[PDB]
Amino acid sequence: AAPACPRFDDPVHAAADPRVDVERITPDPVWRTTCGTLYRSDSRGPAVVFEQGFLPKDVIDGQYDIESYVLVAQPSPYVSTTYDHDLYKTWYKSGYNYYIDAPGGVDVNKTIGDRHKWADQVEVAFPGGIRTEFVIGVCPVDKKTRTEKMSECVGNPHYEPWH
């Protein structure tokens, strides 16, 4: 039987940009307390992501309201991930399925409900993004079949297991 997950005191321990202001998050965030693998579709290549982590577009002046950010894709302090390994299949054009093992994140559907138009994305929004140490690796995606090119997956040399 699997054990329970470590719980960090800092809700944005994972942040690649610690300037994120947690008190500006609206509505009141429901933080993810599980620690399973999460995923992110991204067209940016692993040489970049493994060096930088996932940095958010705008931690200072971006859109801190999660419902707004989910509905209308504005520069924000958040990096979006999903609980769903297979969500990459519904992404048009996104070259890679990144694998993430990071503490925390805001559980979108627990925070804004599961009846909004994108509830099927089962999103976890990371305020301040995600340091490279929490990015496990990546698999490229074959666009025409919407499948992972599993012999071309790559592990992140900077990944640091923590549980």
Residue numbers in the entry: 38 to 200
Q: What text does the study give?
A:
S. scabies produces a 200-residue, 22-kDa protein that is a single-domain enzyme called Scabin. Scabin has been cloned, expressed, and purified, and shown to harbor dual enzymatic activities (GH and ADP-ribosyltransferase). Scabin targets DNA as a substrate for ADP-ribose modification; it also shows enzyme specificity towards genomic DNA from Solanum tuberosum tubers. Scabin shares nearly 40% sequence identity with the Pierisin family of mARTs.
Three residues (Trp128, Trp155, and Gln158) bridge the NAD+ and DNA substrates and these were studied and compared to the Scabin WT enzyme. Herein, the fourth-member of this proposed Scabin-NAD+-DNA bridge, Asn110, was investigated with the N110A variant. In Scabin, the Asn to Ala substitution does not perturb enzyme interaction with the NAD+ substrate, since the Michaelis-Menten constant of the N110A variant, KM(εNAD+)N110A = 66 ± 12 μM, is nearly identical to the WT value—KM(εNAD+)WT = 68 ± 3 μM. In Scabin, the Asn to Ala substitution modestly reduces the interaction with ds-DNA, since the dissociation constant of the N110A variant, KD(21bp-DNA)N110A = 82 ± 5 μM, is higher than the KD of the WT toxin of KD(21bp-DNA) = 51 ± 4 μM. The small effect of substitution with Ala on DNA-binding affinity (1.5×) may reflect the small contribution of the Asn110 H-bond to the binding energy. Notably, replacement of Asn110 with Ala severely compromised the enzyme’s ability to transfer ADP-ribose to ss-DNA, making Asn110 an important DNA-transferase residue in Scabin and the fourth member of the Scabin-NAD+-DNA bridge. Given its conservation among the Pierisin family, Asn110 is the new catalytic cornerstone for DNA substrate modification. All the structures were of high quality, ranging from 1.5 to 1.75 Å.
